[PDB]
Amino acid sequence: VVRIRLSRFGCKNRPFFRVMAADSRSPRDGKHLEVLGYFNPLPGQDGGKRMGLKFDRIKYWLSVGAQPSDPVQRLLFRSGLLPPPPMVAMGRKGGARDT
Amino acid sequence: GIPEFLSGIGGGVETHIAKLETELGDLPKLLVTRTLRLKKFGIPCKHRKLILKYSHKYRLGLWKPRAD
Amino acid sequence: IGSWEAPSDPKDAERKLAQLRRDYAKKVRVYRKEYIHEIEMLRVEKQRK
Amino acid sequence: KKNLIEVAQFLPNWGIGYHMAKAHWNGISYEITKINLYKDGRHGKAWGIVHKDGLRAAEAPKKISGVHKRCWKYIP
Amino acid sequence: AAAAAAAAAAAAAAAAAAAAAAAAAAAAAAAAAAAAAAAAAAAAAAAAAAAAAAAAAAAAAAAAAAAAAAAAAAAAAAAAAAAAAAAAAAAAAAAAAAAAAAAAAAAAAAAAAAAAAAAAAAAAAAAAAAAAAAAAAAAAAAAAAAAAAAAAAAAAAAAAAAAAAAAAAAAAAAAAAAAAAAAAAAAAAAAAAAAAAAAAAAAAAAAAAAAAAAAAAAAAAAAAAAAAAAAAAAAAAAAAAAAAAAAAAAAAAAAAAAAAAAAAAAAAAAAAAAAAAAAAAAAAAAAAAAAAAAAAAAAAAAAAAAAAAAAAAAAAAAAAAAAAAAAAAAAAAAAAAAAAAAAAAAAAA
RNA sequence: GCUAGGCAGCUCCUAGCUCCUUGUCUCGGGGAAGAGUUGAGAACAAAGUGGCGAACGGGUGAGUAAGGCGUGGGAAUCUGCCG
């Protein structure tokens, strides 16, 4: 089962994930089929947000039948190609800011 | 109702019930409060974990405690 | 898209559960079908090339 | 503490031709075709016909299920 | 408790002192929280021994209040004889209505009236005729208006409540009528019938429909309630307006039902608010009512309020649990109240 | 309050959502504690039987001088899970 997934890729205490079409029983960092771009999970300064993904091949691997994991849905819906997570139910109440 | 809701979340917070009681105290303030808030209270990590766990569960309604 | 309002009544999560099962499965299946046909379209284009 | 065989074997001729349903849905039921018991009167496989709210709708012998789940009561 | 009704009552019985037995039966009715099958049996024996038919009748009425008085056949012939040999016509008719709701009994009415001749109680004989009519279980509008004019001549609510129970139990009372309701309301206006006409006018004018329940009709039942001049009756008018929807809108409804009345009244105010709102849309306004109690703290009033709300069995059982586990209550309420909250969890959950 | 079901000659009483039988003791022909088994509320319980995984993921480099490794292939095969 090709699990299109996200492996850690960076220095300690400030990581950087990466999108790769793996095999299930391969290590986290193990033998990948191919990376698929990137996804920096750190908030930035140009647009103070996060970045990163690739397209045009996730189509092919979804078509040939990858069952990935939901921490990847958190991107493959935020950029289309999927439906939203069927666990977007509610939201914490009481966020407060003063700066 | 801090006493029943809590003695429903379990006999692990057998003191954190009262540590929430003597101080401000509230049932929905629990749902809306957060991590460092509850940690300032000296409550250990697994207690905090079960607290927010069952609290999300009730905010959804799947908890609904009853002394059984 | 709105996919909210899962917890409504005491202890009947089967609402969003039915959501999950049929909604999400059929969603993804549909998407996948699309992908199959469109990508094989691309292939036949490459052959015509 | 009663089962499907526990409620059937009461009936004479093994009570082979009556309905039975789940007592909280007056909307469906399955009939008995014929019982085939294992041993010592607690276990038995069979077929039946569907009777939704007493309306027959099934056509061929289809297995009856839950025949070992300990929750049953008869149909009257 | 009834552990206590079975405690020190063995000493009451076998104390060799009818004085001890009488004092202890008074003590048990003073602790006032015990009435069961044990109460009926032990009190029967100890009272037939101690010769205090007054305390006997009191314990028998309490046994009908919290034990089987109409279970299967529930005959009490010598027990009714004692309940009327207390000479209290009131308790006589009470035990009479108990055995009547069990099954047919005319010696019930006869002992009630003999105790009436013993105690000189017009209201008590009125209530005994009430039990008679209710156990007869039949109703008609001609004799209903005649009895309304009779209770009018007496100028009291007693026989009016007699006829009220008679009709609204016999279930052939108005037969979906409006001008006939007007004729019976004229029979009641011949009394001016403050409390009875207020409450029953609310019920009739707001039950299901005559033409349409409007602002005029709702405020009119409220005007009759005002002229009735009773606080619990004001709560009764509020509760009937809650059984019905309202007059104008929900905002005005809440801002009117947010005027707390005195004791015995705010209880049904908050309870009816909870039950009605949960019936209309949700227990949202019932939670607003728990907020009203958690602000103002009408202790025994809101206590019986939340207890009636617990017996109302809405869809928020554990929610009333997490709303009442931190609360107050008066004596002899909280046990049955929270056990019935978990019982509402046994209704829904 | 409103509706579907046994009890003993449409009525007299048992179970449901809106908003329990019989026998001893004792009370009054029906109730009062009382044993035992029909009518339901749930918990893993020993485990087991089982299904799955413990063959992955970790550790070492004695051995192996190429039956290995890299690189490029192929047919004579299989490929739980995924689609």
Side-chain angles (χ1 to χ4, degrees), chain B residues 1-5 27 58 64-66, chain E residues 317-319 321-323 325-326 345 349:
Chain B
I2 272 185
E4 189 169 4
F5 196 114
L27 188 67
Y58 187 91
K64 257 181 61 189
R66 57 188 46 72

Side-chain angles (χ1 to χ4, degrees), chain A residues 42-60:
Chain A
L42 285 190
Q45 60 87 31
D46 178 7
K49 292 303 182 177
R50 290 151 292 235
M51 312 179 197
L53 178 49
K54 186 221 309 163
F55 276 41
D56 205 3
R57 289 279 317 191
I58 299 174
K59 304 189 183 196
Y60 159 90

